[PDB]
Amino acid sequence: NIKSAKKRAIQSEKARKHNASRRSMMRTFIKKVYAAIEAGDKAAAQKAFNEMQPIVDRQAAKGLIHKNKAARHKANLTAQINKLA
Amino acid sequence: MVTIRLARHGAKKRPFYQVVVADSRNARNGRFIERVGFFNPIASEKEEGTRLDLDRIAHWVGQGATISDRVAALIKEVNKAA
Amino acid sequence: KIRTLQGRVVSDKMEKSIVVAIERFVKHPIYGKFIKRTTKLHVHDENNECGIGDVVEIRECRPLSKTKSWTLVRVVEKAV
Amino acid sequence: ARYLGPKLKLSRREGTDLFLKSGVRAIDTKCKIEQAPGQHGARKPRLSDYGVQLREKQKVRRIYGVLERQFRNYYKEAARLKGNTGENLLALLEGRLDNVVYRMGFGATRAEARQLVSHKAIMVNGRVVNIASYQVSPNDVVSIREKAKKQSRVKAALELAEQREKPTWLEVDAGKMEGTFKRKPERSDLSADINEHLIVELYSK
RNA sequence: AAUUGAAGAGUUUGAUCAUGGCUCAGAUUGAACGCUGGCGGCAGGCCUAACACAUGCAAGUCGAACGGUAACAGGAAGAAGCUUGCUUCUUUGCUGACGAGUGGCGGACGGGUGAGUAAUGUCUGGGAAACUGCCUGAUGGAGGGGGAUAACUACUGGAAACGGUAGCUAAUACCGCAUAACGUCGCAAGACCAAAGAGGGGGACCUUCGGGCCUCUUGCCAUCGGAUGUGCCCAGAUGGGAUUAGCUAGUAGGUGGGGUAACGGCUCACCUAGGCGACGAUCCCUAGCUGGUCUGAGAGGAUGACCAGCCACACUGGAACUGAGACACGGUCCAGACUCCUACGGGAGGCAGCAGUGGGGAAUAUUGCACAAUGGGCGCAAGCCUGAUGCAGCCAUGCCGCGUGUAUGAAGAAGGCCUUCGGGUUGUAAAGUACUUUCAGCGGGGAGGAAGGGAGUAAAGUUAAUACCUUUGCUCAUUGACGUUACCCGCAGAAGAAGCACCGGCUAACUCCGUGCCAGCAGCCGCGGUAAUACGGAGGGUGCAAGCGUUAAUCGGAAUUACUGGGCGUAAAGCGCACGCAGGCGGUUUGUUAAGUCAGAUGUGAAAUCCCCGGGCUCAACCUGGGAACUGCAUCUGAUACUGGCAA
Secondary structure, eight states: OOOOEEEHHHHHHHHHHHHHHHHHHHHHHHHHHHTTTTTTTTHHHHHHHHHHHHHHHHHHHHHHSSSHHHHHHHHHHHHHHHHOO | OOEEEEEEEEBTBOOOOEEEEEEETSSSOOSSSSSEEEEOOOSSSSSSSSEEEEEHHHHHHHHTTTTTTTHHHTHHHHHHHH | OOOOOEEEEEEOSHHHHHEEEEEEEOOOOTTTOOOEEEEEEEEOOOOOOTTOOOOEEEEEEEEOOSSEEEEHHHHEHHHH | OOSSSOOOHHHHHSSSOOOOSSSSSOOOSSSOOTTTTTTTTTTTOOOOHHHHHHHHHHHHHHEEEEEHHHHHHHHHHHHHHSSSSHHHHHHHHHTHHHHHHHHTSSSSHOOOHHHHHTTTOOOETTTTOOHHHHBBSSSSEEOOOOSSSSSSHHHHHHHHHTTSSSOOOOOOTTTTTTTEEEEEOOOOGGGOOOOOOHHHHOOOO
16 A cells, blocks of 8 residues: 555565575574484584584574574584484 | 653643653553653743652663653753752 | 462372462451352472372462462471 | 522512612512512411421522522532531632622622622732632732722612621721621621521432 | 531321332433523533445655655856847756655554453462563674675566566675674583664875875664563452353373473373362353442442553454564455456455544534644654644533623503402512623734744864864744634623423422313322313413423432341241251360461552642633542561460
8 A cells, every 4th residue: 555565565575585595594404403313423413513503693693583592493402412422 | 762751731722741751652641650740831920830850850861761852941941940 | 588378289190290279268358258268279299299188388480381380399297 | 590580579488688689778668578479479388398498598599699500519518628517608608709799888789799790890819800709718808990999889889888787707998999808707607597407408318 | 637427208008007019309421302592611522333435634754874866946067149248058966955766764653443352351469481673871893805686778568457578786785704702502622603884074194186094973783781661470359140060182291302582282292191160160141351430428339431551453264474573454465245447368445543425323523724832753953744632613412600780660550360359469570760891792902832943153072173063151033723812901882692391299389261081191199070289271489590301321219139237927038857068157274376367567559530738720610739548469577365277
C-alpha cells in the first residue's frame, strides 16, 4: 500500500534471501558435525567442529543467530565428542 | 529512552503541566515511572507557579534519562533557587 | 533465609517426583469463619526418598516439568 | 432561575412576613396576610408532618431567594462541614453576597440587593463581583463602586436600614458606603423562629 | 482534620394483631421520547450491525551515509538581438538544494474497537532459567582488501498490475582477511569471533598540487554495568449451572537427543502408569479484567461509558519474513466471502485511525482550523511529518453559574372564576410612577497560554590556532490555530428572554362546569351507572424551573436470602427414624511451639477518583498543592491470653 512500506517489503525480501543462504550454510556445517558423530569418528568430527566454529560465532556476530544459540551448538557438540573421545 | 517531560492535565484553555519521567514511547498523559514536579504556566502571580524535585531529576539524568526542551527551560528557570 | 512451606504427601507413585497437599487456614471473606483450605502441588525430589503420608518442607525453584515448580528441602515426620 | 412573581403571595402562604417587600412603608397594611393565599385560602389547612417540614424549607428558600438545586447543594455542604448542620446551613445562606448587601442596608430587599450585586455595582475587596451567591469570607470589605454610588436606591435603602436591628457580625458604616463582614453569624444572632432541624429532617428522608 | 451515621407509607379483614407478597416516596444514567427552550463555563456524545463502505487526510524523515540531477533559483564559460551594456539561448552538480533510487532509522509508538477469552487473561504478592533498538557509565579497538547491485542506458513481455534480458556505477549496503579480550566453548590446554565512515575549520609541511596532515564534533565495533521495556514461572483472588461426575495417552513423571533469548512435554525416541476431580475436574451458558462508577449508614448489591493500567483483535481462516522488538491496523504470502477494473489472459481492495456515507436502531456530532503549546518520529540543527494533541462546529446529554428586572403602587380598576349574590378571589398582581442595565445587541480597548528558535557580539573551555565547535551572559528583529479571545470601558432602552408536571389517599396543593359503567384515568388502593376534590375543560393553588414529565435500567426502602441482620408447634419451613465416613465442633492441668491471633517495622498497594486542610478560575462546576486513605499481601522483629500442633 502506497507508502515507504513498499521499500520495507523489497528490503525484507532481499534480506530474506541473504539470511536464508547464510542460515542454510550454517546448518549444513552443523550437520557435518553431528553427522560425523553418527559414525564413531573422533578426529573427523573434531575437524568438522573446527570447521563450524568460526562460522557459527561469525553468524552470531553478524546478527542472525543471536549468540546464545551459537554457544548452545558448540556446547552440545563438545559434549558429543567427549561422549565419544 | 526515558524522558523527563511535561504532561498536560489542566482544563480547556487552562493547562496545568505535570513533569514526569516516562518511557518515551508511551502516550503523553499515559504511563509514567514517577512524577517529579509540576508546571503551571499561569497559577497567578503569587508564590510558585512551578516546583520541581531537582534531586530525583539529577537521579534520572544520572541513569540516562533525557530531558525535553521545556523541562530544560524550567531547570534553567529555577536554577538552584531562582 | 528462604521462604518455604510444609505439607503432607498425598500420593507417591511417580518417577522421581511427589505431590504435596498444603493446608492454609483462611478466614471467609463474608462470614468470618476460619476455614481449612488445601493447595496440592507437584513437587520434585531427586532419588524419591519420601513416601506416602509423610510431612515435608518444600521451596520454589525453576520449572522442572509442567506444573512442577517446587522441590523439597527436608523430609520430616514419616511415621506410619 | 429566580422567582419573578407576586411576592406577598409567597409571604402569605407561609403566614409570616418574609421581608419580601421591605421598601418604603411600615408593616404590610395591604397584604391581607393570613387570610387567603389563593381562592380557598380562608380554609385552615390541617397540615401534615411532611407539610410542616416542606413548608419550613419553603419558608427559608423564599426568604433568601434560592431555588432547590442550589439549596440542596447548600445542604450537602452544610452536612459535610464539621458541626451543626442546621447552623452550618444558615451560615452558608448568610454568607451569600446578595444577603450581605441586604444586611448592610445597601438594598431595601434581597431582590434589590441581588440586582445591585447582579448589575456590577458591588465590589468585594476591591474587585467587582457580579454573582448573587458569592460566599463572603470573614474580614472582608464589600462596598459599592463609584458608578451606582449616590444613586437614589441605596440612599433610600440606608434610610430604611436604621428601622431594622443592625446585625452584630457587620460593620455597617453608611458614610463611605462600605461594610466589613467580620465573622460568621452565630445561630443565636439571626431570626430565632426558623426551625432548621425540620429541613435537616426534610433532606434526610 | 481526614467515615456527623440509619424515617416510612398504601393494600388481605366487619374490625384486630401477626406473617407475607405487591406497590409508592430517594439517588443515579453514555440515556430515549413528549411539551417547552435565553446566555455562559466545564465535561460527555453509535450502548445496536466486530454490518458494508464512496471521497479526503491519519507515517514519514535524513544528502552531515551514497551514486546522482528530474525540476527551482543562482555561478562559470560560449554564441546572439547587441541598449558595449542589459537581456535571450546553450555546456557544466560548480552551489543552495532536491523528484526518483540505494542506505540508516521510524512504520511493533501514537490512535481504534471489545469480537474472542472463565483463565495461555486480569488483580495482588513472590520468584529465576532470560532478551533488551534508541538513552547512560567504564574499559578498549576502529587495520587492510574484494565482488556486487539498484538508480541509469539499451532492447523487450503485458490492457493494466507488474515484470524480463544485457551492460555501467557508489556507499555507513554486502563479503572475506588481519587483530582478540576481564567475550563464547572448554576442567584446563587451547580453539574461535567485529567494525564505517561523515561533517566544520585550519598554521606549517607534502601534494599524483583532487587532497594528504592537525584539531574538534558526530557516527562504527567488542565486553561489562545501569535504566527502561518485554518474555517466563508460582500462590491466592476474580461469573452462573450438578436437571454437566467423571476427565486425561504428550496425557502425568523420568532418562537422553533436539529446540528457544530463557526454564519447561516446548518437541521427539524410550521407560514408568501416572495426573486432575465433589476445596467441583470435564462439559454448557455468559463475559474483556482492573483503578474505579452508581447506590448504601455500613456490610454489601449492581456495574466497569469518559479518564488511566493490562490483555485481545485489525474483512474471515492460517502462516511465516524482516527486525532490538510483530507472527505486524494503514507490511508480505496463501485460501475464502464480498466489491471493483479488464483487451477475459489476469489484476485490485480492506475506516473496529479522523471526518463522512448507506444500513440497523428509541438513540448519539463536522467530509472544520492549526501544528502556536505538550508529546512523538526523523535529522547535528534548521526544519519536515503528526485526524496524537490543542482548539473550533453541532446537540439542554449532564453538572454548575447567571438572566427574564427593581422599588413603589388600592380606584383593592377592568376582565376571568366562585358566590349563601353581602361579597370573595385572581391581587401589589397589572396599569400608573420612580430607578437599574447582568447577559444578549452595537462600538472601542485588550492580558495570558511564548518557552524556545534565528542573527550578531563578549568571556570561558578545547586546540598549534585569536579558526570551527560547545557553554554562559548581552543586543536585534521576530514565533498564537483558538481569536471580531478571557476580561475592561462606553451606548440605547425594561427594553430580546418561562415553561413543565401535579392537586382523592400515599403526597405539597380545591371549587365550578361538561360527561353519566360512557368517554376515559391509574404506580398501588381503585374512580366513572346525574349534584365526580380521581374523567375532560376552566378558575385557583402546589412542586420544580431552562427545564419539566414519561419510559428503560441499577441500588435503596426490602431485616422480602438476614455476615452485620430473619425464621421453622399452628403462618412457608424439623429428613419417617437411626448408624456412620469425609466435614464442623470439642472437658481439664502442665511444659514446648507460635500456625491462627495480636503489636511494631520494612517493601509494595501506579496516577487520577472518594475524604481532609489549602490555592486558582469574579463564585460554582472545574483545575490543582500537601496529607489521609487504598480496609490488602509478603517479609522480619516480638507477645503467648485464647484457638491449633506436639509431649505428658
